[PDB]
Amino acid sequence: MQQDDDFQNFVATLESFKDLKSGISGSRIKKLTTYALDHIDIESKIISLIIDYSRLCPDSHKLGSLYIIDSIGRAYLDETRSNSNSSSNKPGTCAHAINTLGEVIQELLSDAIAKSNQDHKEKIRMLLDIWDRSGLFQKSYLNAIRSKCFAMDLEHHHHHH
């Protein structure tokens, strides 16, 4: 950790991501994840970055950022979980990280799904299901997506179950 693989690598990966034309390469996501975990002393900047990147641009970033946060979230959760997930306010470590995200996931998801279309919207929906199943954000479906009205509203002209 001698000034090697600092925020540069992280930010660099994300930046290059958006620079793409709706490609979303898993490689990038990996770098961000491994990096975050490798450096739990920067959960703030990290989580904050991905978060902003999402709400930043429309569906485009929405979907992309979503995937990124997903990977980091899972890993982070397991990490802190291994010891004890506890927090109150402001960033500090994995714990605070997950908490912060869950406090913004509302606008993030909602926006993503909305700005997203049948295709994109579909990806988000699936991801959400896996999240609950796995046990990432054990908040009993936050008000955010909680209100099915979210999908129903954004749900363009199309049949469904």
Partner: peptide
């Protein structure tokens, strides 16, 4: 595009 595209959350 050969770059391990399509990142699924169900698979790390």
């Amino acid at each position: 595009d050969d770059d391990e595209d399509g990142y699924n959350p169900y698979t790390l």
